[PDB]
Design a protein around this ligand. Structure first.
Ligand SMILES: Nc1ncnc2c1ncn2[C@@H]1O[C@H](COP(=O)(O)OP(=O)(O)O)[C@@H](O)[C@H]1O
Length: 233
């Protein structure tokens, strides 16, 4: 059984979303127990498709240093997080966790409407916490929806990364595709955030050796790439 929230536990909107009719094929996908989604052959569901035409597999990722017993498990990817075929990818969401713009809107677009439907089953997400859902039409199996702080709040951003890494550990997920949380419209300075991102990930990797195969940092913008590229050296 999975741990699907990292914290401790509009309303008409969610009831509305949940009352919409589903096809039998859609209902079948949505009914798959969350713990079983990791290993299922998703093409046994007649209504499933991957909405990304050429996903990026873990064998196509470039470790920063295969020699290093830490950096062999970190990689940088240039492009959108939704491309990565990993156990989970990270969504930079908001309190309501009912979609929106930026990466959040992109992840809901690619995954399809069942993602929103799953998000409507629970009561949003607190800043610093993380919700686990299936990822439907994404090549990735799960989505880890975290809510980043608005503005530079280092303790909150650190919490986001620990919450993500925690649910990955508690549920036996071995790869994670990250996006650069809070550094878009939430206006968290990119360099301090990147240092926190890589910092927590390194710490975790040292404290839980062998727990993760790969932590991929997806850089949607060219500067995001270069920033991470040097912050890892
Ligand atoms: N359409 C998109 N596809 C993929 N990634 C995106 C898209 N839009 C924004 N991002 C990325 O998501 C990360 C967070 O940005 P944003 O979506 O504004 O979230 P936040 O509200 O936490 O800043 C950034 O790295 C940004 O480049």
């Amino acid at each position: 059984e999975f741990v699907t929230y990292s914290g401790e536990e509009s309303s008409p909107t969610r009831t509305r979303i949940l009352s919409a009719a589903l096809s039998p094929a859609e209902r079948a996908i949505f009914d798959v127990p969350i713990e079983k989604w990791l290993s299922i052959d998703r093409s046994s569901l007649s209504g499933w498709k991957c909405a990304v035409p050429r996903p990026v597999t873990i064998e196509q990722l470039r470790p920063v240093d295969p020699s290093d017993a830490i950096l062999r498990h970190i990689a940088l990817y240039r492009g959108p997080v939704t491309d990565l075929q990993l156990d989970a990818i990270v969504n930079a969401a908001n309190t309501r966790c009912l979609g929106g713009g930026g990466v959040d809107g992109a992840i809901h677009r690619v995954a399809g409407p069942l993602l929103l439907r799953e998000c409507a089953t629970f009561n949003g997400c607190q800043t610093g916490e993380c919700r686990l859902t299936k990822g439907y039409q994404l090549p990735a199996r799960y989505v880890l929806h975290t809510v980043g702080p608005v503005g530079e709040r280092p303790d909150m951003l650190r919490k986001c990364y620990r919450s993500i890494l925690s649910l990955a550990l508690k549920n036996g997920l071995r790869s994670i595709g990250f996006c650069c949380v809070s550094t878009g419209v939430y206006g968290y300075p990119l360099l301090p955030a990147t240092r926190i991102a890589l910092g927590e990930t390194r710490k975790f990797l040292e404290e839980h050796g062998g727990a993760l195969d790969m932590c991929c940092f997806a850089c949607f913008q060219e500067d995001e790439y270069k920033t991470y590229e040097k912050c890892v050296g």
